[PDB]
């Protein structure tokens, strides 16, 4: 990885069970209670992670990779805010 900069995703209004292909993932909240984002979430030999205070059960599927997700783009995108790693 470079930079540590895992994948994120969005809430459009939040399903309750999302499908994930990567098993790395970080919650996004911004200004939140908690540390960090929201918090931090990893799956390694639990494929099946639902994030705290959020009700977004990242499942992951054989059925699924990393070049796929969930029923609608619940896919964070970065649009212009983009550094090509600055020196
Ligand atoms: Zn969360």
């Not at 908690?34 to 499942?59: A, N």
């Not at 699924?64 to 983009?82: D, F, V």
């Amino acid at each position: 990885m470079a930079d540590y900069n895992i994948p994120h995703f969005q809430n459009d209004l939040g399903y309750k069970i999302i499908e994930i292909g990567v098993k790395e993932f970080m919650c996004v909240g911004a200004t939140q209670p908690f540390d960090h984002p929201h918090i931090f979430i990893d799956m390694g030999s639990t494929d099946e992670k639902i994030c705290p205070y959020c009700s977004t059960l990242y499942r992951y599927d054989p059925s699924l990779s990393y070049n796929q997700t969930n029923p609608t783009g619940c896919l964070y995108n970065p649009k212009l805010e983009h550094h090509h790693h600055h020196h």
